[PDB]
Amino acid sequence: PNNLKEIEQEIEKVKNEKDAAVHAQEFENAANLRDKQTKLEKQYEEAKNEWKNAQNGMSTSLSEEDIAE
Amino acid sequence: PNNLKEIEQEIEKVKNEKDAAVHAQEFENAANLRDKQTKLEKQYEEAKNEWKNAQNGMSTSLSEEDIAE
């Protein structure tokens, strides 16, 4: 639902940014990025779990409209 | 003269120690070790240069005792 998409993208760019710091020996910034990534993943798990939890709230059923299409 | 040896040994263990921090994502310790390694190499260059500076001061001569041995 257009939420875990962008959140996952931020995790990707953060990981690349940390890799650049590691190869450049900029460990001062790398330490901050490591904690930031953990923050992103922590909220990522909660956001995904609540989404699938709400998915079970409603049941997807077919209808003659779908077959008509 | 037991000077470049001891400095090189400390540089060697520091280099391995930094790798331990990097693989363990201990970036805070990595920065501290990185500065220490640079400081040691600074002393290594000075000690190595001044060692051969003293060596060039005198010239080794072949005494007849060396031939006798």
Curated annotation (Swiss-Prot), chains A, B:
Q: Any coiled-coil ranges, and where? A: none
Induction details: By heat shock. Transcriptionally regulated by CtsR. Up-regulated by heavy metals such as Cu(2+) and Cd(2+), but Zn(2+) and Co(2+) have no effect. Forms part of an operon with ctsR, mcsA and mcsB.
Residue ranges constituting the UVR domain according to the UniProt record: 8-43
Instruction: Say what the protein does.
Output: Required for growth at high temperatures, probably by acting as a chaperone during heat shock and targeting heat-denatured proteins for degradation by ClpP. Required for biofilm formation. May act as a chaperone regulating CtsR activity.
UniProt record similarity statement: Belongs to the ClpA/ClpB family. ClpC subfamily.
Quaternary structure and interacting proteins, as annotated: May interact with ClpP.
Name assigned to this protein: ATP-dependent Clp protease ATP-binding subunit ClpC
Full-sequence range covered: 410 to 478 of 818
